[PDB]
């Protein structure tokens, strides 16, 4: 699981 | 699962 | 600015 | 600006 | 601006 | 601007 | 599953 | 499943 | 600015 | 500025 | 500025 | 599990 | 400035 | 588990 | 400035 | 487990 | 377990 | 266990 907010 | 907000 | 990942 | 990933 | 992914 | 993916 | 908001 | 909002 | 990852 | 990772 | 990791 | 807020 | 790691 | 706030 | 690690 | 606030 | 606040 | 506040 990969969750990113840029 | 990959979730990205740019 | 609101950014949300559930 | 509102960005949401469920 | 509203962007939503369910 | 409203963009929605169910 | 890949979900992206740009 | 791939869901993208640009 | 609000950024949240659940 | 608020940034939260649960 | 508030940054929290649970 | 990888969760990143930039 | 508040930074918390639980 | 890797959680990062930048 | 408040920094806390539990 | 790695948790970082920068 | 590694927890860092910079 | 390594906990660092810089």
Numbering used by the authors:
A (entry chain B), B (entry chain B), C (entry chain A), D (entry chain A), E (entry chain A), F (entry chain A), ...: 1 to 6
Paper quotes:
High expression of PSMαs, which are four peptides of about 20-residues in length, increases virulence potential of methicillin-resistant S. aureus (MRSA). Amyloid aggregation plays roles in PSM activities in S. aureus. In the present study, we investigated the structure-function relationships of PSMαs and their short truncations.
To obtain atomic-level insights into the architecture of PSMα1 and PSMα4 fibrils, we computationally identified their amyloidogenic spine segments, and determined their high-resolution structures by means of X-ray microcrystallography. Segments PSMα1-IIKVIK and PSMα4-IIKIIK, both of which are conserved within naturally occurring PSM truncations, adopt the canonical cross-β fibril architecture, wherein pairs of β-sheets tightly mate through a dry interface, forming a steric zipper. Both structures belong to the class 1 of steric zippers, indicating that parallel β-sheets mate face-to-face in the fibrils formed by the PSMα1-IIKVIK and PSMα4-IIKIIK segments. Proline substitutions in these spine regions abolished fibril formation of the full-length PSMα1 and PSMα4. Structural indicators of fibril stability of the IIKVIK and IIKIIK segments, i.e., buried surface area and shape complementarity between sheets, calculated from the crystal structures, resemble those of eukaryotic steric-zipper structures. The contrasting levels of stability of PSMα3-LFKFFK and PSMα4-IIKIIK fibrils, inferred from structural analyses, were verified experimentally. Specifically, PSMα3-LFKFFK fibrils dissolve upon heating to 50 °C, and reform upon cooling, whereas PSMα4-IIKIIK fibrils remain stable. While PSMα3 forms cross-α fibrils and enhances toxicity against human cells, PSMα1 and PSMα4 form cross-β fibrils which likely play a role in stabilizing the biofilm matrix. The highly stable steric zipper structures, forming the spines of the cross-β fibrils, putatively serve as the building block cementing the biofilm and creating the rigidity that can explain the resistance of amyloid-containing biofilms. The atomic structures of the PSMα1 and PSMα4 derivatives offer templates for the design of anti-biofilm compounds.
